[PDB]
């Protein structure tokens, strides 16, 4: 209702860096909020694309940011009569960034990996990897749960089971309040997709530089399947967490599988052992139902609701004609031991090719009326196609169909304004939560502040 559109703050990265592809609020030990920005096409120190992360301190004037430095040197280890190799070129460091306590986790989903052994190899493949940083100490750690030392032939001999070579770990990511890092790896198990979880503390304590293949004993990975419904489902394209089984002691995970069951798409609510609690099926093929997932209590009953985005949903129109506009599905959580039902509300975009529902951000209580609110992105929406972010306030009945406020892109065409969003954090300490929007095409991030 009251994000200020006139008094924006622009943070900028280098040209062609995709500064703003991903972002999050990060809070230091003192409590001072900053903004972590991922820039997955940033040139490294040798003029080759590696990606990078920037840690922006809060300023009204905005501007340039300092780089959160990470090791961009390739590694080679000759051990156990094998040769391990990491390849950081075009790895897309900062394709996802997430913050937790005093830690920042930035991932490079397309970091490649190979293992040579005489004339054979595992194959040079994008296992992905996450770089963990604790800025106030300087400590660095990595996590790359899909690396293996199994050779090419053995996979063939076992019908490509448990094949983690193409995981792209860190494609999506989220952290629980306790400090469990959960990564989406949609290329997992020969493109079915998997999730990998491990405590942040245990990632840090088990990592040493140069080892490349190490054990994180507390880690837990999801499972391979022979159910054709899961084939090419990209299970883990998006990931989120919340409370969906009533037991406050346990944490539930929400996984997006946008191409699940022959491109029908699906989102799953799972326990922390990766057992399915519920499955939400997509409405229309190729709509990418599961591209985005968001969890927040919007109707004020204290039960987390679920929001799923299908940005390529084609809407019906006069004379049997379809129109790609995007759609978002609201699922309110009922009382007792009951599953989630049909959508309580369908929010459909209006601009052709707008990709409404490409990003869904919980805003917290933007106007302090008692109900939590959300922001939905249409990165190519608005009359001109420059992009749009629509604010929806919560109420007892769920959400309003009509947005409370529309944010038009201040950047030129192709910025992808809204492709990434984040809220629920008061960056200027005025008591109201604020919204940060990324425009990777324009190499920038816009900060909208909330007012009385």
């Amino acid at each position, epitope marked *: 209702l009251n994000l200020d559109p006139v008094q924006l703050t622009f943070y900028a990265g280098p040209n062609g860096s995709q500064f703003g592809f991903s972002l999050d609020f990060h809070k230091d030990s003192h409590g001072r909020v900053a903004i972590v920005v991922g820039a997955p096409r940033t040139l490294g120190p040798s003029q080759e694309e590696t990606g990078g992360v920037f840690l922006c301190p809060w300023r009204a004037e905005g501007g340039q940011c300092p780089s959160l430095l990470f090791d961009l040197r390739d590694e080679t280890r000759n051990v*156990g*009569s094998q040769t391990l190799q990491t390849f950081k070129a075009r790895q897309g460091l900062g394709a996802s960034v997430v913050s937790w306590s005093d830690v920042i986790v930035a991932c490079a989903p397309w970091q490649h990996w190979n293992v040579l052994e005489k004339t054979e190899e595992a194959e040079k493949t994008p296992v992905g990897s996450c770089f963990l940083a604790q800025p106030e100490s300087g400590r660095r750690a990595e996590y790359s749960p899909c690396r293996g030392n199994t050779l090419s032939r053995i996979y063939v001999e076992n019908d490509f089971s448990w094949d983690k070579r193409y995981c792209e770990a860190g494609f999506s990511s989220v952290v629980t309040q306790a400090g469990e890092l959960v990564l989406g790896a949609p290329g997992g198990y020969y493109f079915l997709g998997l999730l990998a979880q491990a405590p942040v503390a245990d990632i840090f304590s088990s990592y040493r530089p*140069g080892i490349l*293949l190490w054990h994180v*004993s507390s880690q837990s990975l999801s499972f391979d399947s022979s159910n054709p419904e899961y084939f090419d489902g990209y299970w883990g394209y998006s990931v989120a967490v919340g409370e969906f089984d009533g037991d406050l002691n346990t944490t539930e995970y929400v996984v997006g599988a946008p191409t699940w069951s022959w491109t029908l798409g699906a989102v799953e609510i799972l326990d922390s052992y990766y057992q399915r609690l519920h499955r939400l099926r997509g409405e229309q093929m190729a709509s990418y139902f599961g591209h985005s997932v968001a969890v927040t209590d919007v109707n004020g009953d204290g039960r987390h609701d679920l929001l799923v985005g299908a940005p390529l949903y084609m809407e019906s129109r006069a004379d049997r004609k379809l129109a790609e506009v995007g759609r978002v599905y609201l699922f309110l959580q009922p009382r007792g031991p009951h599953a989630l039902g049909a959508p309580s509300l369908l929010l459909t975009g209006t601009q052709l090719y707008g990709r409404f529902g490409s990003a869904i951000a919980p805003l917290g209580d933007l106007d302090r009326d008692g109900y939590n609110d959300i922001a939905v992105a249409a990165p190519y929406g608005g009359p001109s196609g420059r992009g749009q972010v629509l604010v929806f306030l919560g109420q007892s009945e769920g959400l309003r169909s009509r947005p409370s406020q529309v944010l038009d892109s201040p950047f030129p065409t192709g910025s992808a304004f809204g492709f990434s969003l984040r809220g629920a954090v008061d960056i200027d300490d005025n008591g109201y939560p604020d919204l940060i929007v990324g425009a990777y095409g324009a190499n920038q991030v816009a900060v909208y502040r909330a007012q009385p």
Partner: antibody
Amino acid sequence: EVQLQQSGAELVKPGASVKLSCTASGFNIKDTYVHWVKQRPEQGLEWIGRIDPANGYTKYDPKFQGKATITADTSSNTAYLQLSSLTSEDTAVYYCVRPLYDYYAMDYWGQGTSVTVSS
Amino acid sequence: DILMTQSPSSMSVSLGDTVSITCHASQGISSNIGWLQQKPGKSFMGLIYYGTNLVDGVPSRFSGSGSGADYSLTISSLDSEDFADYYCVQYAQLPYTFGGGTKLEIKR
């Protein structure tokens, strides 16, 4: 607390076989490679081989190929070493080993199993 | 196979001394070396992995160093518990191979 619990001392006859066991406590045996090592007062430490209990695949020093068969069972969280065609050279203390973090390391050791081959 | 030659086979040293045990590989093993301790009549404990990394719980007075084919384990300010046997193991290549051993012994 990671701890490898090996089976008790063996007194066996030449030409026979023996099978030593190594049960994981405080962790799952499929978590890492499990190695088997031989120790003798004069000859010192010799590496016999390893198993990846997740999939059963093994590696052996050519010296022990044929004599040693390493196996593992994830149902009982136990790894095994079987020595066939026992000789006086097989009188030794046998250890199972696993790494802490580094896949390839030799960090945690069992308490050892003594085998004595005699008539 | 890689031959690991450990030196000395024994040394006679005192409490509070700083001592080094060396291990020479027959070829480069780029830090793929571990150091092990065996106390009298006891089993093995890992001290260092990958050349310089202390195993969890190992006291700071132990340290590893070296590169290529030549490595050292240094114990600083010997404790009475440190009078034991020490072995290097390489895992650069299969078969893994061990050094001969070094026995720390009380000087009198």
